[PDB]
């Protein structure tokens, strides 16, 4: 079901003392084979390339000759004039290429089955050609770098102590650096002291508790669905260009939200308070970012028709829109009024609609049963029922029926700053996930 589970799996070492970078790696590989990964021995370059036309036969289910494979390798796979940035774009955006056969039919060569992640075949390899390294290579392409260190290599100098042809290793995206007592991980950004332990992440338990060891780290994050959802569903390739990785508790609460959708939709229930729920991420969230990811996953999640992430306004609507055209492609604003907003409810392909609560109230005081009424629609509020109580909520329970009523909030019921609105417990149901 989930990715981050509430129960915590056991922690063990694989030692084979970690001062040597050649022994416990083998036990790690054998644990991955116990997780169902496949160690092959290609300590070379060209045959590894042929491994790609090994995998894609399995992947897209179609057959190359040699010449079209040279065309695909030259023109799309291993364009030599390109760096890590556009190749990262090919990871997260341009992961499909059209191709014309000698039969002259156009077929869409994929790279990752982002629909059925279980279809995607994985492999694991290790050191060759320097240092002693571990490489997780999925569907032919190498993705995850793993380097163990000594006990002497401190967590601050995990990066601060250590740091064509071949150009095939340019596809490497994640720098998962370990030492024996800790493991951190980050994107394709290698600044010296700013991207140290502060900007990298330890893995954590279900709610808050961080992880230090290795084999438990393996049994958590190196799972099949887990590592793929890391690589696909929770990777934010900002068009800075900068890849961003979400916090683990962010991903966990997102999983709680989407699984709540999955559970309530198959139970064909709507409009209950306990069908809702809310998140106390008042700080350390990137509530913009986490809301964007949850919203886009709702849009692709296809149970529904519309996702209304609504807020109240004090330079918020222009702000987060500006935050989300950073997250480049698609978001319909609530500009400028409830005139063409109905055209926006008519419109799709730009599915996420963001507006003020007061524009919505200008639609909900009147306007007499909009055609998106009895449709499956998810209302992602912000500043939950401790900061919304009135005409929105009462005409929400009055008018609207098939709403999935969620919301991030920095405002649950506090003793400190609860001068916003009414209760949340019998209105939005129960609290779901929180962070200090």
């Amino acid at each position: 079901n989930f990715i981050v589970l509430d129960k915590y799996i056991k922690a063990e070492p694989t030692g084979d003392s970690y001062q040597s970078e050649s022994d416990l790696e083998r036990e790690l590989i054998q644990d991955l084979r116990n997780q169902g990964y496949e160690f092959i021995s290609v300590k070379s370059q060209s045959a590894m390339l042929a491994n790609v036309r090994e995998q894609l036969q399995n992947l897209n289910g179609v057959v190359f000759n040699d010449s079209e494979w040279r065309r695909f390798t030259e023109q799309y796979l291993d364009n030599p004039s390109d760096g890590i940035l556009d190749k990262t774009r090919k990871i997260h955006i341009d992961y499909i290429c059209d191709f014309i056969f000698d039969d002259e039919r156009l077929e869409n060569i994929y790279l990752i089955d982002k629909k059925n992640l279980m279809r995607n075949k994985v492999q694991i390899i290790q050191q060759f050609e320097n240092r002693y390294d571990v490489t997780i290579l999925v569907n032919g392409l190498p993705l995850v770098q793993i380097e163990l260190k000594k006990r002497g290599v401190a967590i601050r100098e995990a990066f601060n102590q250590i740091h064509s042809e071949n150009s095939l290793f340019k596809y490497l995206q994640l720098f998962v650096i370990s030492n024996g007592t800790d493991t951190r991980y980050f994107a394709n950004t290698t600044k010296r002291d700013k991207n140290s332990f502060d900007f990298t992440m330890n893995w954590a338990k279900s709610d808050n508790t961080l992880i230090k060891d290795l084999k438990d780290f393996t049994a958590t994050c190196f799972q099949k669905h887990t590592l793929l959802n890391v690589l696909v569903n929770y990777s934010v390739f900002d068009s800075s260009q900068t890849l961003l990785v979400m916090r683990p508790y962010q991903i966990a609460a997102t999983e709680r939200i989407l699984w709540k959708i999955k559970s309530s939709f198959t139970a064909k229930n709507w409009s209950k308070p306990e069908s809702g729920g809310y998140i106390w991420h008042t700080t350390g969230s990137g509530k913009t970012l986490t809301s964007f990811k949850a919203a886009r996953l709702a849009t692709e999640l296809d149970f529904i028709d519309k996702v209304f992430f609504v807020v109240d306004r004090k330079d918020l609507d222009y702000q987060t829109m500006k935050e989300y055209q950073r997250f480049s492609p698609d978001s319909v604003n609530g500009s400028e009024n409830t005139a063409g907003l109905k055209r926006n409810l008519d419109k799709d392909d730009n599915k996420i609609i963001v507006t003020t609560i007061q524009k919505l109230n200008n639609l909900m005081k009147a306007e007499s049963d909009l055609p998106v009424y009895n449709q499956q629609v998810v209302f992602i509020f912000d500043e939950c029922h401790r900061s919304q109580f009135g005409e929105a909520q009462k005409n929400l329970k009055k008018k609207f029926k098939r709403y999935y009523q969620f919301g991030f909030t920095g405002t649950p019921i506090f003793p400190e700053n609860a001068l916003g609105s009414e209760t949340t417990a019998s209105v939005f149901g129960r609290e779901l996930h929180s962070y200090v």
């Binding site: 200008n362 900061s387 109580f389 001068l419």
Partner: protein, 163 residues
Amino acid sequence: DMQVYIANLGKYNEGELVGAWFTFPIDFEEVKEKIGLNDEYEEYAIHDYELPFTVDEYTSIGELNRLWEMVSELPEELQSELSALLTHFSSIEELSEHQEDIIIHSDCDDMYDVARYYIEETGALGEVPASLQNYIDYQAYGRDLDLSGTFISTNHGIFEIVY
């Protein structure tokens, strides 16, 4: 058209959310009876507006009626394109300075029509011989007027800010 959601700074987090929409003219005591009070005077929390322009989060209501009277002062085709016209300018009294200085073209719809108007019917050169009738580069004439003149392409026509 031109209505604001303004209340209240009491319970600053948009608690005591009252007062739906206020078309102009807008009074202190009218909104005050709409909202009561927040035991003191901290109100007109500007958070939402149907306005054809850009307004600020703490603009006083007398200034709001001032802006509305400047809107109602202007002709309605200019009231429709205040958003486009204010791009060149910065305020409305500024716009009220050169409100005489706007050339309106419902007749002209692109730059080509502007060139054909200012050449043919204006008669900026006189003779149009039949040997020369086709042979007036309206495209380059529009490029040169675009270099010189301040032009704005709108829905209802083309507006020339001539000084």
